[PDB]
Design a protein around this ligand. Sequence first.
Ligand code: HEM
Ligand code: HEM
Ligand SMILES: C[C@H](O)[C@H](O)[C@H]1CNc2nc(N)[nH]c(=O)c2N1
Ligand SMILES: C[C@H](O)[C@H](O)[C@H]1CNc2nc(N)[nH]c(=O)c2N1
Ligand SMILES: CON(C)C(=N)/N=C/CC[C@H](N)C(=O)O
Ligand SMILES: CON(C)C(=N)/N=C/CC[C@H](N)C(=O)O
Ligand SMILES: [Zn+2]
Lengths: 407, 411
Amino acid sequence: RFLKVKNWETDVVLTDTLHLKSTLETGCTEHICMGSIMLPTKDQLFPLAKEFLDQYYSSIKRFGSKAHMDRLEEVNKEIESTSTYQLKDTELIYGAKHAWRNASRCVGRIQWSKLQVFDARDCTTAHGMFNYICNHVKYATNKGNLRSAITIFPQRTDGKHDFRVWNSQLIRYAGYKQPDGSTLGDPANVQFTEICIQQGWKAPRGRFDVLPLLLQANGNDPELFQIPPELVLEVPIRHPKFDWFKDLGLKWYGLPAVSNMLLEIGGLEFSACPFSGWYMGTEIGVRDYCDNSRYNILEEVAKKMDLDMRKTSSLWKDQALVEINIAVLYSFQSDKVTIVDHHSATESFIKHMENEYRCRGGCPADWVWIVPPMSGSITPVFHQEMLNYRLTPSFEYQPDPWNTHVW
Amino acid sequence: RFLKVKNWETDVVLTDTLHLKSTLETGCTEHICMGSIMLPVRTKDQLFPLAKEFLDQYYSSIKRFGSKAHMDRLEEVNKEIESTSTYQLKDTELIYGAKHAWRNASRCVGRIQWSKLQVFDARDCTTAHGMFNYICNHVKYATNKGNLRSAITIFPQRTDGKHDFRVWNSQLIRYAGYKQPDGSTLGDPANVQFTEICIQQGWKAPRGRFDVLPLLLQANGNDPELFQIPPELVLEVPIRHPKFDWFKDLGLKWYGLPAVSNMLLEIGGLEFSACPFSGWYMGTEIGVRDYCDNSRYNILEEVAKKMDLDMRKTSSLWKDQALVEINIAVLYSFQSDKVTIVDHHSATESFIKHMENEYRCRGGCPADWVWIVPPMSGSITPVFHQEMLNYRLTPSFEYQPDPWNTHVWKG
Ligand code: HEM
Ligand code: HEM
Ligand SMILES: C[C@H](O)[C@H](O)[C@H]1CNc2nc(N)[nH]c(=O)c2N1
Ligand SMILES: C[C@H](O)[C@H](O)[C@H]1CNc2nc(N)[nH]c(=O)c2N1
Ligand SMILES: CON(C)C(=N)/N=C/CC[C@H](N)C(=O)O
Ligand SMILES: CON(C)C(=N)/N=C/CC[C@H](N)C(=O)O
Ligand SMILES: [Zn+2]
């Protein structure tokens, strides 16, 4: 019941005790493992609140102090009365840093404690949300020297007054279905792109159109807004040895900023909480560019390289994959936009795991997400056993608002 | 109740009911997933149920469930168990059993082939020398001059746990590992311990980078014995690259026949502790893992040096570039010598088709995603995007401890 994890390349064995503090369910049972599935009252609120405050006061070496006992009463009285409660700033900051700390799918968590938290709980309108977001984007972009940040909008009330960013990331490219049957731009965003168009956006109908923000305050209908282009840092993609690479016409944006998730802290639900850090190269080079259902450029790149595309066993896909990812790296580096390669990231995450094992007694890690989608086994995370479990505070998925929202 | 898996690339949704016929445990609980953990004397008491379940399966497969021959077989197994404590499989039940253990191996990407398996019945074997003869026949049959054929050889089942047949090698064919006084390793570092055991048992070691290990064989719970596979039976392939002429001068080769020999086969509750089986290699096994694991041959530096890559920063992706070239070389070398091999694109595509067939015909297909997805180019193979349910079905192959860890030395 104290569990061991072995690294098979180093034989380093770590003992996990943090899992016993585990809260939610995984989706697995003793009969069936669901490891590779993508999506596997006043009465409820007080336990959740207490559980959170207890770990907060423990973290600041004040467990069982009068300041602890007092906050616990003050929160309880506020729930008994208002049916919700408000977090102190210090708790909000702790809660967000820790939700990132607990994110089992994030390889970048060595960074978890440098998070700039922007408290937007005073926001009331879409225009206000727009101001907050532009500010986050500029702050985080930092002219290419990216800094992690989250912006937190007001917490859920009766669930008819939700704040929501409808975008899946603050910045993403448009996707359009054509008469052709094919898809122009990013096919991941086809549906959102049509919701924007349906709302009244004028699409340039190109390959890399930055989507408009679609913002919903206090449960109202959402509203379109263009992010000032001078705030959207983008990198043209070239290759350090293939001169023709630039003619492929590829670019990507510098700032990854997930915006459709829900932050839960002490039973409280923050349904609009966009956060951002910086890219690992493979996210763009392998997934965004090469997934068959994304930009799908392997065919075209291989041609420019004059590889034998006649049989799979030439490994032409694999060969092209590497060059594309060399190119993503080289470009961001050339332009001084922060980016991390998969070797460095995974090495860092291993050191993070070791840190957490000795300091916290463990680290929840979803191996399926942690191992990069190229060159898996030449990264140390491949050989690392990982235990996956759910801790709060957390980031959780939540339904796309268009299936829910009342118009 | 039914369970769905989705392919995120095609939106194809599958429904699994087969997991309902699982009972063995996974290592996971509702609070912890152990999906990436490598490793997460039976009495009459347990035995008849395990026998019954298996024979109910066998008899349904052959469309004879509830038949007179079905019922008589249950009754006869029942009587044999109570009289003798154990029972013997018929030849047909053994064949069906070994095939189904392959079919249910959730870590095998090659299962499209599950029904084409040559079963060698070595249940009459009594000595190590007898084991050696059986294994040679296996290797010559499976090898077939490069045109590989899947096969398994099944030595007598466990009785009291004191009379076990064991193949002490982890594969029938594999290279020696030698730890030097300077702390480096010559040959394969995966095989250092087993190599040391062989030497202690009397093996004269050539001490090279690719010495084919001797078979170390145990019959009927006796001290195991050494045997040299005849070299003319060991197909090996020198590794060269179609465009890099210096590649051959690295001096790499590999054997063509992968044959796992240290697993236990369970059929209707019986335990076959020596059951070596073989098919053919997926290229990444040798190219990615055997050559490129840091704990294995570890050739990335030597290779990349030769390619004159920028080795001064990881972000050149010099490792990734050399890895691809090494894998191209492995597949080129095998195909040029007409030894069967499969690339990872081809093997994963076939597996997805196998998997869907199995959902439609069988009601499911247990798969372990962590193992199925190849250790290079993960997401450009269709399995990466395929959700999978992992669970334990019988008949099965299982791990078992290395025999030097349990064996009582006779002398
Ligand atoms: C600072 C640099 C960071 C790096 C290099 C990094 C790395 C990654 C990578 C590679 C993924 C997989 C994403 C995908 O495959 O789509 C990921 C997922 C995740 N990251 Fe991090 N991350 C970083 C910062 C952050 C921050 C600041 C937060 C929250 C405050 C965070 C929370 C998460 C969450 C919740 C997921 C899973 C998203 C999902 O399930 O779709 N990351 N991260
Ligand atoms: C026909 C050619 C075959 C191919 C291309 C194939 C493919 C693979 C690959 C790539 C692995 C992963 C091995 C590793 O990473 O160490 C594997 C594992 C496995 N395969 Fe297959 N296989 C084939 C035939 C068979 C046969 C004939 C059996 C037994 C009847 C079998 C049963 C297994 C089992 C039990 C494992 C798990 C081994 C372990 O956990 O260490 N395979 N196979
Ligand atoms: C089916 C499978 O779980 C799915 O493809 C996962 C696998 N691993 C992943 N890993 C990361 N980092 N990102 C992803 O989107 C996925 N997709
Ligand atoms: C800890 C981790 O599960 C381990 O390294 C696994 C991952 N996936 C694998 N997949 C295959 N095919 N072979 C392996 O040896 C491994 N190793
Ligand atoms: C916000 O999370 N971070 C910092 C990150 N690197 N990646 C997030 C998801 C981005 C997505 N994989 C993409 O490729 O755009
Ligand atoms: C026995 O299973 N088969 C046929 C197979 N392809 N792989 C078996 C293990 C081989 C091991 N990974 C190796 O590289 O030697
Ligand atoms: Zn699990």
